[PDB]
Design a protein around this ligand. Structure first.
Ligand SMILES: CCCCCCCCCCCCCCCCCC(=O)OC[C@H](COP(=O)([O-])OCC[N+](C)(C)C)OC(=O)CCCCCCCCCCCCCCCCC
Ligand SMILES: CCCCCCCCCCCCCCCCCC(=O)OC[C@H](COP(=O)([O-])OCC[N+](C)(C)C)OC(=O)CCCCCCCCCCCCCCCCC
Ligand code: HEM
Lengths: 55, 52, 445, 53, 78, 102, 32, 57, 420, 302, 160
């Protein structure tokens, strides 16, 4: 048997980038704004997709 | 700051002046070929004819 | 005293010609010992694919017995006078040399004449030396840099007499007979292609009269009125890859065509080779070596060793590098070596030009120190240049080499030229010919 | 500097009348001066105060 | 002839170890290369003995006996 | 004039805030290549002390707390341990740049 | 032995200026 | 014992006795060479039997 | 003008030898009595790390400055260390010889020995030891010294693997302080001026001037060790206690070594005048290599026979060589053979000192051991003064003395000491 | 080919403690052939042992005259049935051997351990001799090991003699090893680097005093009681009982009762102990040393 | 080697992760520590924690009669082979009279072994392992040792 999370290619890329990424322990709430920017980007993608769907 | 002010760097620079200048001439002639400047292409003895 | 007037104060070499055309040359020194040798223009460039091992197998049979001293009597005489007897063969030159004391000069000259013009080839000795040369062939390809040396010459001078090795192939070893050896001896051991060179405590008039007494009238006749000639050898850009992954290290040699023996650019190319240099894993310099390739290799742990070479033959040669590295850094060292070569081609800098000039001066004088190397230089110089080039002339050429002519000659011989590549071992990561070529030129000049 | 960007936002909101022109010029001049001149000199002064050389 | 280089003829470079601090102008011959020698396996460190009571019993007194097993760790009995 | 200078330096040292986390000036030095070479040239015990101090500062910053008043490092016991190693590294680097320049 | 390794002939592939091995290059390589 | 020829430098360099005056090794028997690659005449040897093999049972 | 040696003894004990032959390359050596024999069981390999540490940071010159300056002027810096001696040799143009002098003297006398530099250099120590033991002859000789001697000369020239990774700057500083003193140093210069050599020695050699830490006298033990490693060729060195160097008995041992065979003289030669080669080849058809191994250090010597053979024929070759030496000890030898041995020894000595590197090494060793140069004519005279009965006595001493054997290979047929 | 890596790992694990290496070196310097052969594979032989060599070894030494099939908790009929089913196809005596000629000597491996190990042995009797029984009694007299956790070894003469002139950690014992045709009896000393010389000298002088005759009958009786108790505790478990009956089946070809074994152990006399100690003292010596060997004496210094 | 019956040992040999591992069940008066001790290198701690937790929850979720019978035979042989010998018999007697107040006979132990089957093995494993806060003790290069939240997340499955 193998560890699928670190042996599957897309899954090991995801694991090394976002799951088992070594992050600093002491980063404050100012470090959340990159993830907030990405989520706002996705929100803009979907919401504007519906706007251009009806525009 | 003072990394590029010495005799070795000066003679490397003046060795590379002809190559960099020729590359600049290549960039200039390619840009005027791409953009078709009247101000340059009206003075060459051939290419000026097709503008009329 | 300074370097220039010291090089003037080095004693000169007296050259004389006998009636048969053989060149007797000598350099006198204050040493109590002398080194006397015979250098003959014979080798694989003269061998013609049916007697490819003739000269080297004759080098085997030279010390095994002669007409005057049969069997071990000659070796007994050499041991009794305490001399050291050595020989070597190349693609162009075959040499037999003796190191002895100064008082044994007549015995040394007589023994050398006996070796040269009175060699006896007994058939039982021929068979025993056939076994010996097969065993030494196995020992030679047991070593690994000689294999890449021969592979590089084969892929560089393919279709020419310069590709074939000095020791020849095993089939030629097994089918060579006494008649072919005698034909080679009567064809390529002529007087006008031989230099008797002595160095050390040797007096030139004594050497001349000893040559007149013993070594005069070697052949003087070609017995067909036919002197063989050396055709030019075509250099083909090519690559040979002997993949065998069981070997722990990979040897890769990359070369281009050299200028030749008499070409004036040889000094400039030696300056460039001094700038690039050589390195192995036992050098204690560390990361502070002046050579950029050596510094990069020791910083990144790329190779076990590398070297630059400039082999010269009659109007041809092989100029390049040879490196031993593991299978995971061959492309790295090919990239960095090509970067260093084109850095000399385009942006050679006067500081390392002067550094390479000093290195070449030190290398020349330190090699020429010693009776046996200076005798070898005398013999090879009278064979190749037709004269012994003085150290004053060498230093004058080194002094007149500057940065501009260095980068000009380097762009002439290195920049945008098809190379000869010889890889041996785990050479999977060795880049192919197209990538080696694309490293041999740059897109920014 | 952050205060200066807030001043710049307010002035860009406001029209072209007295004294918004001179407030905008002073704000832009101070913004560029802080971001290009004042901050590296403050860093050098900071290093000297901490006795790093 | 008061030197080992002139005293032992062929054994002089065996009796003398030569290493250069800086590279010479002339390259040598037989440069040599380490052919990537293997690494010993990593093992758990054994306890030392700082007292006579802990050192007692460690001296061998019997022929050496090796023992391996299919699912039993190997044991060496002294 | 010197005493007022030391007093103002101590006031700035308190106002900087890295004494509250148990750090020293060398601990708060940013790792340039020269700084990293100096840290590699540090001995074992100073390296371990520096890395433990850095880890404790990271823990305190994660908890958004500072050390108690008696556990603050003071101005007179702040040692410049990285200073000679860093000076040597910069000196060797400047020698290398001078040799490459000439 | 390694000396038995002789490179095979390529005359079916060579250009017109490099057919013979008795004529040196650098008077035709630059033209090619 | 002092000098031996060098292939790359083309000069008589320094060496030990064991590679200067005995370049042939101390091997007992000269081993055979490798196979003849790119041979015109090929003689394949029959391995075991074809009727003994090719059995999927 | 080629002049003779100029010798001076400074008040701190330093010996200076100079020879101005106006050679184009000036070569300056500095010879210290700091070989591997001066270490004890607690700091083995310190001499090896010191030999490899000749391009480190010094007081007044950094490692980068030393390496770049010497390679820019084109000179070379090498360290040749035997079990008794260490030679630091610099070589270069006469114009750059002053900075070569100050670099060599900085390296020899003022080593900073920073911890990170030796920590980086331990890997190079591993690489150098592996390259040195790539051939079996060096391994056999090191094992032979370890078997033959007890304390002093049994210390290996290369660092033991347990001591690797454990040599420290404090131990290196202790070794340099205790053994790099002016009474054990000799500064020799070829192609330089005696006045400038003297002045640079007196303005770089004020810091250390003592006699130094005296080493222990070497004690002989004898015995044998075997490296069963399955090689096709069996190496076997069988030696015994001989005279220390600088003796008439040492000269007799050298004459006996050249009588029994002290290396080949003809490429691919049959060695028809070597007595050992004759005695082995009279009964063996397999290839072999039998020679006489002589090594005379200033405290004591090792003389014996060295043998490379096949696995099956190793016992036959060793027995034939030992029987030949026993016949020589009984006295079955001829004055013609003795004269040929003397001529071979004279030719070997003159060929060793005709090269300038060998000349520098010989003058440095002579300056260390005796303090004055003794000309080669006197060497020739004393070699002639060696008698035949002295050779017979030396062979009897080797036969009667207890033996030290170092063997390696496939030893199914290699005999032992009590089987000889 | 997959198993040779496990061979290397097993050698490293077995050599994790220095007594294994000391005993291997001691056998190597004590014998010339057939007992200088290491019990673990040499590093050069790793990567070189072939399946043909394994087949040759099995076919030459796994023969019926050299095998003994013993069983606890199994029926004799079942054992005989499986024996005639499987083991009947083997030939006979197979290869003979090499008689294990003695050489003596010494080797000293310096590896910088905190302690110094030194084994000094000499030739002794083989398995099945009253001299061998006397050597075992002498080994238990000089101290074959501790009987108390964190004890002082009051009865152990070697331990008392070494502890008389030391204040450092140490361990001295009597090493005895008998075989088919040769034996090795001697002393084993683990000591400090500085005190190795005095520890070895004190142990050797204690054995020399025993050889001269400085012993009492009460200590001989105590040694006999120790040997009888050790033998009975060896037979006590099923592992030791099976190993004992297998070893007896190989060596003697017949089973010997523990009552008879204890009877002959009691029949060992003290004069035989003196004779065995004299044999060890006067015999040629084999020394295997390891550690920091600056103060460890050589064989001629003893 | 690879073909060991224990799947944790088999995957350890197959992926070359650990140096060794063992399982312990230490019991005191109404208290116990039950788990696994493993020594490995710094590049395999995460892998062995993942595999050990996977095997624990495989026992908690999907037991098998064949492997349960194998383990019962293993425990039978371990018990009788340990009680072979008078010193372990005396040790068991002393420990049993100190702990149970009586000496549990081998017949009673065999009866309990025969009583254990896969269903109550699954129930007891889910009672004692599944969704339980562990005690973790690490020593050495344990930077790759997973976080405690990751250990808990491995100590419950999302598919069960
Ligand atoms: C698609 C076909 C062309 C592929 C590109 C190609 O062959 O490049 C040739 C080569 C690279 O391939 P190459 O391997 O033939 O390069 C040989 C280069 N010389 C002749 C100098 C030795 O490209 C160049 O040299 C640069 C091409 C671009 C030139 C600059 C831009 C010009 C227009 C400016 C606006
Ligand atoms: C590159 C910058 C110069 C480009 C340029 O002038 O292009 C002129 C050319 C045309 O040349 P042109 O001579 O017609 O110039 C047009 C400019 N006026 C009308 C003001 C005289 O423009 C382009 O190709 C567009 C370039 C956009 C960037
Ligand atoms: C694929 C991604 C996006 C799509 C399809 C999209 C689509 C649209 C459409 C169709 C409109 C006009 C509809 C309307 O305004 O009623 C609009 C307006 C607008 N968009 Fe996007 N958008 C996208 C991303 C973004 C992003 C990333 C931003 C800013 C960071 C943005 C900023 C705006 C703004 C400010 C308006 C003006 C809304 C208003 O004035 O009512 N959009 N978008």
């Amino acid at each position: 048997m193998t560890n699928m999370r670190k042996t599957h290619p897309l899954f090991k890329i995801i694991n090394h980038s976002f799951i088992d990424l070594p992050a600093p322990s002491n980063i404050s709430s100012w470090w959340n704004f990159g993830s907030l920017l990405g989520v706002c980007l996705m929100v803009q993608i979907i919401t504007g997709l519906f706007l251009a769907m009806h525009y | 700051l003072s990394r590029f002010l010495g005799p070795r760097y000066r003679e490397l620079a003046r060795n590379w002046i002809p190559t960099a200048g020729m590359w600049g001439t290549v960039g200039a002639v390619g840009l005027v070929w791409a953009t078709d400047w009247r101000l340059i292409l009206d003075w060459v003895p051939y290419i000026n004819g097709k503008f009329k | 005293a300074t370097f220039a007037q010291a090089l003037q104060s080095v004693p000169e070499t007296q050259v004389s010609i006998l009636d048969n055309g053989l060149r007797v040359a000598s350099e006198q020194s204050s040493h109590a010992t002398c080194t006397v040798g015979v250098w003959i223009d014979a080798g694989s460039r003269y061998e013609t694919e049916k007697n490819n091992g003739a000269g080297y197998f004759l080098e085997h049979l030279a010390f095994k017995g002669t007409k005057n001293r049969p069997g071990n009597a000659l070796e007994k005489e050499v041991e009794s006078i305490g001399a050291h007897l050595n020989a070597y063969s190349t693609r162009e030159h075959t040499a037999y040399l003796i190191k002895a004391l100064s008082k044994d000069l007549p015995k040394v000259v007589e023994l050398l004449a006996d070796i040269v013009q009175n060699s006896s080839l007994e058939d039982s000795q021929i068979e025993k030396e056939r076994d010996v040369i097969l065993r030494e062939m196995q020992e030679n390809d047991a070593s690994m840099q000689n294999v890449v040396f021969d592979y590089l010459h084969a892929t560089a001078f393919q279709g020419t007499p310069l590709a074939q090795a000095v020791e020849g192939p095993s089939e030629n070893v097994r089918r060579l007979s006494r008649t072919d050896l005698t034909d080679y001896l009567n064809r390529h051991y002529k007087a006008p292609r031989m230099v008797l060179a002595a160095a050390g405590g040797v007096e030139h008039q004594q050497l001349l009269d000893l040559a007149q007494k013993h070594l005069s009238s070697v052949s003087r006749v070609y017995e067909e009125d036919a002197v063989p000639g050396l055709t030019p050898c075509r250099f083909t850009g090519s690559e040979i890859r002997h993949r065998d992954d069981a070997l722990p290290l990979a040897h890769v040699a990359i070369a281009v065509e050299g200028p030749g023996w008499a070409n004036p650019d040889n000094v400039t190319l030696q300056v460039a080779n001094a700038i690039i240099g050589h390195y192995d894993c036992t050098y204690g310099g560390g990361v502070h070596l002046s050579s950029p390739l050596a510094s990069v290799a020791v910083a990144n742990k790329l190779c076990q060793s590398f070297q630059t070479f400039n082999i010269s033959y009659s109007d041809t040669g092989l100029l390049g590098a040879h490196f031993v590295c593991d299978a995971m850094s061959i492309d790295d060292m090919v990239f960095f070596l090509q970067g260093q070569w084109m850095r000399l081609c385009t942006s050679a800098t006067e500081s390392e030009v002067t550094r390479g000039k000093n290195i070449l001066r030190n290398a020349l004088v330190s090699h020429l120190d010693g009776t046996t190397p200076v005798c070898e230089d005398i013999g090879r110089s009278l064979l190749t240049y037709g004269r012994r080039i003085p150290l004053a002339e060498w230093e004058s050429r080194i002094q007149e080499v500057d940065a501009q002519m260095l980068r000009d000659i380097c762009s002439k011989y290195f920049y945008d030229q098809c190379p000869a590549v010889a890889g041996y071992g785990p050479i999977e990561q060795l880049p192919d010919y197209n990538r080696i070529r694309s490293g041999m030129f740059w897109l920014r000049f | 500097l952050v205060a200066n960007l807030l001043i710049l936002t307010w002035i860009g909101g406001q029209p072209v009348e007295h004294p918004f022109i001179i407030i905008g010029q002073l704000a832009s001049i101070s913004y560029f001066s802080i971001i290009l001149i004042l901050m590296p000199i403050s860093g050098i002064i900071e290093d000297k105060m901490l006795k790093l050389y | 002839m008061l030197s080992v280089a002139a005293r032992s003829g062929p054994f002089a470079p065996v009796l003398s170890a030569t290493s250069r601090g800086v590279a010479g102008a002339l390259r040598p011959l037989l440069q040599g290369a380490v052919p990537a020698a293997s690494e010993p396996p990593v093992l758990d460190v054994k306890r030392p003995f700082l007292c006579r009571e802990s050192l007692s019993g460690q001296a061998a007194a019997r022929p050496l006996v090796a023992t391996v097993g299919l699912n039993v760790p190997a044991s060496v009995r002294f | 004039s010197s005493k007022w200078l030391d007093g103002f330096r101590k006031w700035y040292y308190n106002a900087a805030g890295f004494n509250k986390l148990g750090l020293m000036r060398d601990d708060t030095l940013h790792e340039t290549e020269d700084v990293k070479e100096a840290i590699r040239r540090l001995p074992e015990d100073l390296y371990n002390d520096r890395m433990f101090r850095i880890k404790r500062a990271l823990d305190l910053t994660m908890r958004h707390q500072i050390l108690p008043k008696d556990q603050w490092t003071k101005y007179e016991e702040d040692k410049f341990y990285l200073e000679p190693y860093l000076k040597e590294v910069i000196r060797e680097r400047k020698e290398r740049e001078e040799w490459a320049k000439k | 032995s390694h000396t038995d390794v002789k490179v095979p002939d390529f005359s079916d592939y060579r250009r017109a200026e490099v057919l013979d091995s008795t004529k040196s290059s650098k008077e035709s390589s630059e033209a090619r | 014992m002092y000098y031996k020829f060098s292939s790359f430098t083309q000069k008589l360099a320094g060496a030990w006795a064991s590679e200067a005056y005995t370049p042939q090794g101390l091997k007992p028997v000269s081993x055979x060479x490798x196979x003849x690659x790119x041979x015109x005449x090929x003689x394949x040897x029959x391995x075991x039997x074809x009727x003994x093999x090719s059995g999927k049972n | 003008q080629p002049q003779d040696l100029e010798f001076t003894k400074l008040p701190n004990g330093l010996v200076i030898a100079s020879l101005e032959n106006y050679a184009p390359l000036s070569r300056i050596g500095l010879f210290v009595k700091a070989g591997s024999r001066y270490e004890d069981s607690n700091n083995l390999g310190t001499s090896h790390l010191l030999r490899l540490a000749s391009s480190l940071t010094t007081k007044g010159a950094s490692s980068f400055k030393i390496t770049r300056g010497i390679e820019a002027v084109g000179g070379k810096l090498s360290v040749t260390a035997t079990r008794e001696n260490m030679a630091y040799t610099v070589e270069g143009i006469r114009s750059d010889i002053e900075i070569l002098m100050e670099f060599l003297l900085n390296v020899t006398t003022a080593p900073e020995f920073r911890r990170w530099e030796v920590a980086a250099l331990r890997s190079q120590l591993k690489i150098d030891k592996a390259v040195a033991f790539q051939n079996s002859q060096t391994r056999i000789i090191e094992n032979l010294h370890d078997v033959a001697y007890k304390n002093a000369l049994a210390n290996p020239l290369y660092c033991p693997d347990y001591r690797m990774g454990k040599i420290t700057s404090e131990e290196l500083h202790y070794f340099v302080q205790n053994h790099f003193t002016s009474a054990r140093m000799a500064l020799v210069g070829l192609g330089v001026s005696h006045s400038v050599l003297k002045q640079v020695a007196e303005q770089f050699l004020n810091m250390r001037g003592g006699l130094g830490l005296a080493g222990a006298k070497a004690k002989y033990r004898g015995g044998e060790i075997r490296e069963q490693n399955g090689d096709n060729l069996v190496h076997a060195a069988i030696v015994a206690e001989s005279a220390a160097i600088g003796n008439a008995e040492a000269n007799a041992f050298s004459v006996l070594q050249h009588l029994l065979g002290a290396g080949p003289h003809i490429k691919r030669g049959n060695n028809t005048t070597s007595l050992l080669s004759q005695s082995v080849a009279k009964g063996s058809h397999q290839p072999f290599d039998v020679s006489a191994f002589n090594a005379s250090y200033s405290d004591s010597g090792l003389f014996g026979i060295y043998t490379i053979s096949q696995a099956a024929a190793a016992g036959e070759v060793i027995n034939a060589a030992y029987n030949q030496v026993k016949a020589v000890a009984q006295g079955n030898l001829s004055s013609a053979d003795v004269q040929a041995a003397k001529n071979k020894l004279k030719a070997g000595y003159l060929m060793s000192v005709e090269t300038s590197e060998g000349f520098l090494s010989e003058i440095g060793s002579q300056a260390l051991a005796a303090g004055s140069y003794m000309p080669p004519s006197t060497v020739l005279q004393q070699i002639d003064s060696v008698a035949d009965a002295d050779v017979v006595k030396a062979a009897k001493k080797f036969v009667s003395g207890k033996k030290s054997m170092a063997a390696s290979g496939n030893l199914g047929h290699t005999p032992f000491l009590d089987e000889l």
